Ligand binder design. Structure first.
Ligand SMILES: O=C(C[C@@]1(C(=O)Nc2cncc3ccccc23)CCOc2ccc(Cl)cc21)N1CCC[C@@H]1Cn1ccnc1
Ligand SMILES: [Cl-]
Lengths: 302, 298
């Protein structure tokens, strides 16, 4: 019993965190095999950030300009290339602590763990989701750039995020491990704003199923809804449209609890209408949207 | 910017998790040097009588895909200490510490000696933890990392009928009035960790949330009279002193922040949130707020 926002054990990722320094800039890098991956803005100063020509800044750099540090050991950079917004620093030593890994690009609504690092040193781990507006509501201070987002499925670490910037609303933008940004974001200190955020509906439904599994049924009603009428109501509360894929993905949770997805949808409709009325659901006074159907099946069952 | 429930990096603890099996019972063990620590209920009650019937080879210990041979066994309160032939090479710098209610720690939840998740939680004033544990999680540990040293503070033993959890420090002493026995046990009436709510209000001010602030101040006694009415833990002078650095950083005196809390308790949030929450968060200590809003690394 119990429902917590649970991050994956960070151990496999901790053994990959290194410090990357180029001139005065110092951020984090991910050392996997003989390659260190880090945000390409490590080559930039604060001046360069307005309109940086990365190919032009990188062509002026040699291998020895990049000081890489794994613990108390300096790694020798033997090569460097750029893949989108990530810099790939070829080093002379392969990381002995390299785990089984994959680079995965996630879709909005997907959750992952973030190992927040400063100066190549892991300082904390937390769980978060890719918001529908392609930002993450993270906890990052200056020097956290290069901190990574990951999921561990079995023994394999699936890297899905590298931190690059904080938007003016305090939310964060980053890339996948191939340098492609999530969202219309760019690694430039230009006028960029996070789009209007929406609630991840499939996740709220999944979290309501977790509450039913944990014995909380106060929010259930005798009503059902059509997918279209639910989306008409959901859109008015800035909820993401629930698609037929979301309904299919919720199938196992619906079967386990005996509450049809559209029946749970009607509870959500009523919850949006009435609020909680001094009540909580899984110790929360707000509808939680940062637990996927897979997270619920993982934590409530296995 | 950003405020999340943040756990310590679990890596140093992951390298200590082993599987302990005695008969049909299977749970987790903490392998530190040549000893494996685990709940004494793995033998299951008269624990001296059940343990005297066990030999070393009855305890199957598994570190990954390697079986460890138990060469000895002793009991320290509610914890079983299984002496193994091999010292854990991944043993970190560590201490066994007993924590006080209100203090927080990270829990590395494990099943069959395999870490599956990490979360932050606080020792509730009623000595239970609002954790997330399924069957097979017994032996999962609570810890804080101070610089390079892992301070083990909790070993999970059981779940109470309200879904909350009970366990011991790493010396086998239970937190709270619990016993490792299938009997009528209930968690006492819980209270809100006041110093933690105040610390979390300071974190909201650091993150640019000032809607709840007012021009008012209060005396410690008047705040305690109000707090005791809402099942809040009494705020002591030590709490006031501990919140000093946050009071200096934000320019809001502790009794000034207490007046904000008093108004939130009597009036509510009014459709507003603080750090994305509609409830007053009490599972962040003043140190957690300082550590997260400074960037302390391990
Ligand atoms: O500019 C940036 C980083 C930046 C950014 O967002 N940083 C931060 C990240 N995470 C959390 C943060 C919390 C508090 C303050 C800053 C944070 C600044 C704002 O403008 C942008 C715009 C775009 C991008 Cl991709 C990056 C940034 N850096 C980081 C190194 C190199 C370079 C120039 N540089 C040098 C020395 N300090 C900064
Ligand atoms: Cl995905």
């Amino acid at each position: 019993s119990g429902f917590r926002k649970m991050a994956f054990p960070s151990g496999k990722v901790e053994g990959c965190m290194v410090q990357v320094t180029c001139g005065t800039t110092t951020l984090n890098g991910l050392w996997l095999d003989d390659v260190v991956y880090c945000p390409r803005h490590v080559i930039c100063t604060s001046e360069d950030m307005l309109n940086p020509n990365y190919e032009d800044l990188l062509i002026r750099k040699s291998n020895h300009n990049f000081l890489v540090q794994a613990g108390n050991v300096q790694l020798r950079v033997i090569g460097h290339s750029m893949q989108n917004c990530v810099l790939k620093l070829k080093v002379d030593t392969a990381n002995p602590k390299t785990p089984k890994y994959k680079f995965v690009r996630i879709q909005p609504g997907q959750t992952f763990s973030v190992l927040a690092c400063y100066n190549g040193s892991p300082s904390g781990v937390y769980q978060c989701a890719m918001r529908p507006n392609f930002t993450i509501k993270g906890s990052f201070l200056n020097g956290s750039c290069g901190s990574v987002g990951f999921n561990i499925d079995y023994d394999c670490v699936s890297f899905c995020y590298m931190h690059h910037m904080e938007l003016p609303t305090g939310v964060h933008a980053g890339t996948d491990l191939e340098g492609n940004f999530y969202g219309p974001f760019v690694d430039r200190q230009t006028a960029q704003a996070a789009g209007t955020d929406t609630t991840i509906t499939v996740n709220v439904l999944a979290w309501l199923y977790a509450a039913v599994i944990n014995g909380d049924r106060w929010f259930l009603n005798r009503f059902t809804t059509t997918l279209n009428d639910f989306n008409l109501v959901a859109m008015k509360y800035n909820y993401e449209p629930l698609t037929q894929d979301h309904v299919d993905i919720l199938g196992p949770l619906s079967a386990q609890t005996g509450i049809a997805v559209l029946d749970m949808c009607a509870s959500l409709k009523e919850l949006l209408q009435n609020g909680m009325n001094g009540r909580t659901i899984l110790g929360s006074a707000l509808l939680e949207d940062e637990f996927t159907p897979f997270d619920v099946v993982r934590q409530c069952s296995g």
